Amino acid sequence: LPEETILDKLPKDFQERITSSKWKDRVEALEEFWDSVLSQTKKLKSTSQNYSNLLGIYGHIIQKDANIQAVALAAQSVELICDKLKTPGFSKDYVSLVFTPLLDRTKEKKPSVIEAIRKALLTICKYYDPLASSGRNEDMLKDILEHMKHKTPQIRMECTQLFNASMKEEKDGYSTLQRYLKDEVVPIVIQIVNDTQPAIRTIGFESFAILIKIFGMNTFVKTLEHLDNLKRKKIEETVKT
Amino acid sequence: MREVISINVGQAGCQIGNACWELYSLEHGIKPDGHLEDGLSKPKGGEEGFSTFFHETGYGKFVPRAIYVDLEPNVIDEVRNGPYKDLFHPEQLISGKEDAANNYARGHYTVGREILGDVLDRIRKLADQCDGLQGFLFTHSLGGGTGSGLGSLLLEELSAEYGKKSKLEFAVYPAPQVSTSVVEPYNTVLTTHTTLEHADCTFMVDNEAIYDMCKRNLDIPRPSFANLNNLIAQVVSSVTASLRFDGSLNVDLNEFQTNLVPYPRIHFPLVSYSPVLSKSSVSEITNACFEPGNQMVKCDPRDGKYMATCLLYRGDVVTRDVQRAVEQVKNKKTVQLVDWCPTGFKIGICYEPPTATPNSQLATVDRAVCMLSNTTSIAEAWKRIDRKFDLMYAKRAFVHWYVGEGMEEGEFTEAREDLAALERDYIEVGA
Amino acid sequence: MREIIHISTGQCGNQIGAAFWETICGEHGLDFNGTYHGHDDIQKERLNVYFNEASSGKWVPRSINVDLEPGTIDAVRNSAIGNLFRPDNYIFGQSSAGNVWAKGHYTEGAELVDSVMDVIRREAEGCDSLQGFQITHSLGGGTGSGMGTLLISKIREEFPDRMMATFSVLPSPKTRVEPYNATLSVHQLVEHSDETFCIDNEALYDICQLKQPSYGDLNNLVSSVMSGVTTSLRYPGQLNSDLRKLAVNLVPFPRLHFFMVGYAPLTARSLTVPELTQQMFDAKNMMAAADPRNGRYLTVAAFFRGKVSVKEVEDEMHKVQSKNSDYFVEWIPNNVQTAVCSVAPQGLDMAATFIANSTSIQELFKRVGDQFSAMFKRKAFLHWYTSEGMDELEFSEAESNMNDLVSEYQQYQEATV
Ligand SMILES: Nc1nc2c(ncn2[C@@H]2O[C@H](COP(=O)(O)OP(=O)(O)OP(=O)(O)O)[C@@H](O)[C@H]2O)c(=O)[nH]1
Ligand SMILES: Nc1nc2c(ncn2[C@@H]2O[C@H](COP(=O)(O)OP(=O)(O)OP(=O)(O)O)[C@@H](O)[C@H]2O)c(=O)[nH]1
Ligand SMILES: [Mg+2]
Ligand SMILES: [Mg+2]
């Protein structure tokens, strides 16, 4: 599988266009570069190729742009670059450029836009496990957890679901998860389980059910007894699933 | 002295509280200042049972042992600005910023849970000023959001922090003539469930009964809450009279339990009061307690069976006339008394005359009586609210408001199954 | 203090909003300079719900006027009511939504949202205890519909537990893309609105046609309603004092929160309570092209104003409920909440406002769905929408969603036991 370059294939006016006040310039600029290049890419070259600017641009669009179409495009491109560059190519320097913007823009509801954001988030987390036993990606873990306390209920849902995915897909130990457990994870999980909206309480039930499946039904017994009898029974029921 | 702390929750509890403490203050010769009326030296009640409800500061002022709690400042601001603004210490009146919006869930799980810290604190502060705290009087509505949600929440905590202390509940049962919400049957069933184990004695007050009493007896074509509360305060005053003055029965919050409840769950006495007359004899008022139009709950006392009874007389009363009146009820036979009740009716007299406030429509009477009877006919109150509950819940109407406020939908079922059990337990114990 | 933040979006929303503010100004005894000249205390009590006390003693509306085009906002500027409006509460772009939902929701409107959001954030900071928002707009246009529903969603993201009331004007067959804009907005309202007052522009026209009316004549009618609708919110008080208490009482199910509204008296000598009541429930007095008799009342919030006895009103409302018992569902005890307020409108003795959650409102949606499907099957005008960032499945979503709404309203129409 040959490796390609993409930085020498940008539109010569990309910088002026992408930074244009006209939405159409930004959308066309992204869509063009995607169709003519990123879409037809199978492998990338990390050698003597710096993606910082490009990813920084994307990351900026994802976080602050109002046109959700351009947001969906940037997230799709970031996901393309990351999956086709893999590791150690896509460095933590690149992760820090696009991870927080994506976590911030999980507020979106539009199916195609949030799907792009989820894919990007899952692809980066795939190559960088937030719960790594090395404890190298704890910064991302703090990021997810801090977002699971966000004022916006949509972000709490999307990030807690992302957190659950990290727990489920973890297959290399749970040492990083144990440290943040009683002092960070459980206090946040309890807030989710006790949320006003039932759609969010359900996600909480799943989280506690997973924590129970891992660390055992016993180690939380003092915590569970404080919940509502029905919230406790819900988790008890979810654990079976 | 054996102090009694009076807690009021929600608009109904607080407005009834205003009518009660206005009357209490008059019956003990205390002005809205907290000071004694001109030329009194000491308040009328004590030295005896006056200290039970009031606190003597030391500089000539008397303060009600009361706590007002609401999740909106509106009702309590009327107290803070009214003529009785100085009666209660400002710390005794607690208000939030946003109410429970006719929703038991945000009174129990959401907003009512924000103020809970403050309330329990003031209660502890008031309880620490007591040489021998006797218990609590809990006054609230079961139809509101704060009365129901924060109320039951408060009873739950009170049972925890004060396990050895008794709690008498005054619950305002909802009526359609003066309803403020469509989901009142939901709140009522939920409150009954979560307070069925955190109350030693519960005195139900059907607003439909009080409304009809004001309409029939006092001849008011459309009674306001003020009319209702004036009558209610007259009843509550009569009940607490033995505690606040010299009585021979129910002179203790614990004697209500002892004399009325056989089993813990069966703690819902039917209250009767007589006479109820507008400004415009013992035998007669005693017989009136056993007739349909003199109860605090819409029902026919002639139906169902009596399990226990406490006739509390007030004012100009001589033991001969009451001994006659009581045996008159037994002998000619309104019994209708369960075969397993040993001693039948218990009598109590408080020679202090009953009082009516000038700013009301009630006539001052020489003597009055109040009967507290644990009868099965009160199950009608739960049956009527049960049909209301079932009709709506069969379609899960308005439930998304509760489930959307942190409550699990299962509690609707558990609460309804519990009330169905309470109904069965009542018709079953009358057997 | 339970403040409410008003938002006027679009030409319609800004002209109806203006008429509204201009109306309630008088009922609270306020000059158009903000100074209070009322002769009652009731007018001053719940005054801070809609108005902000400027240090000068004057009272300024808590209104935010938003329009992608500077046209109508400039008309409101140099108007009578334009004097007490806060200058920096005027938000406006240079472009226009061109009467297409897409330009308001994704494109040009999406670029102006953050500028208005700053102002509502500043307003919300100056609230003792903000209860919610109220929005005036047309569902037929591009700005009011598209940007309005965008603003609603973005408002809920930042204020999740604050109430969301909406005054939405539905278009009548009388500008060829209104079924598109309307259906796409209804899909947003059902998801992100707590309370929606449906003001069919056909019903307003029909009623004014009092003996062809202009938009101004329609606006007075709308303004009169909104004044009546918000009587519980602006005066103390017992029934439905909050937007929240009202929602709990009017909304049995989450996506059934679209209310019909009736008002009386209209006409062109003084009325009796029975006449005021019978006129109110009349189909000729409904502000929506739909006969309530073709459906059932799930809930009702009747508001009476002026010199009337509480008893006479309750006795009459009860009599109507008993007589017309078939037009009320039996599985909701005490559907109808009846309130009374001493403060009358101006210049009237007494008046009655009628908020209903009737199932017959399905006729409104069912009508638009037919016009929507008529165009959509031909794929008409789609270019003007998909060129902005929309997809066809978004149209099909809104269509089938509004279809489910009709099915739902119809489902409880027939509910038994
Ligand atoms: N007897 C009597 N009943 C009242 C009074 N005020 C309200 N109620 C009843 O109480 C029920 C509603 O509850 P609220 O009194 O508003 O109590 P709340 O907890 O403050 O209700 P929220 O608005 O949710 O805070 C209604 O069914 C009324 O019939 C009153 O002053 N006297
Ligand atoms: N009742 C009433 N309806 C109005 C009024 N003005 C506009 N409309 C309705 O609004 C619909 C179109 O939206 P508009 O309010 O005109 O304008 P917009 O929604 O802001 O869209 P833009 O053109 O981008 O500004 C029309 O179908 C009208 O029926 C009004 O003053 N009163
Ligand atoms: Mg209240
Ligand atoms: Mg316009």
Numbering used by the authors:
A (entry chain C): 319 to 559
B (entry chain A): 1 to 280, 288 to 438
C (entry chain B): 1 to 174, 178 to 212, 215 to 216, 219 to 275, 282 to 430
Authors' account:
These essential proteins use multiple αβ-tubulin binding tumor overexpressed gene (TOG) domains to selectively recognize the growing microtubule end and promote its elongation. A recent study from our group revealed that the TOG1 domain from Stu2p binds preferentially to a ‘curved’ conformation of αβ-tubulin that cannot be incorporated into the body of the microtubule.
The structure was determined by molecular replacement from crystals that diffracted anisotropically to a minimum Bragg spacing of 2.8 Å. The structure of the TOG2:αβ-tubulin complex is remarkably similar to that of the TOG1:αβ-tubulin complex. Conserved residues like W341 and R519 on the tubulin-binding surface of TOG2 make very similar contacts with αβ-tubulin as their equivalents in TOG1 (W23 and R200, respectively). Because the TOG2 domains pack differently in the ‘bound’ and ‘free’ crystals, the similarity in structure suggests that these TOG domains are rigid modules that do not change conformation when they bind αβ-tubulin. Even though the structure reported here was obtained from a new crystal form, the conformation of αβ-tubulin in complex with TOG2 is nearly identical to that seen for TOG1-bound αβ-tubulin (12.3° of curvature in the TOG2 complex vs 13.1° in the TOG1 complex), and is characteristically distinct from the straight conformation of αβ-tubulin (1° of curvature by our measure). Underscoring this similarity, individual tubulin chains between the TOG1 and TOG2 complexes superimpose on each other with 0.4 Å rmsd over Cα atoms. Thus, both TOG1 and TOG2 bind preferentially to the same, curved conformation of αβ-tubulin. Because TOG:αβ-tubulin interactions are required for plus-end localization of Stu2p/XMAP215 polymerases, preferential binding of TOGs to curved αβ-tubulin suggests that curved αβ-tubulin itself is the distinctive end-specific feature the polymerase recognizes.
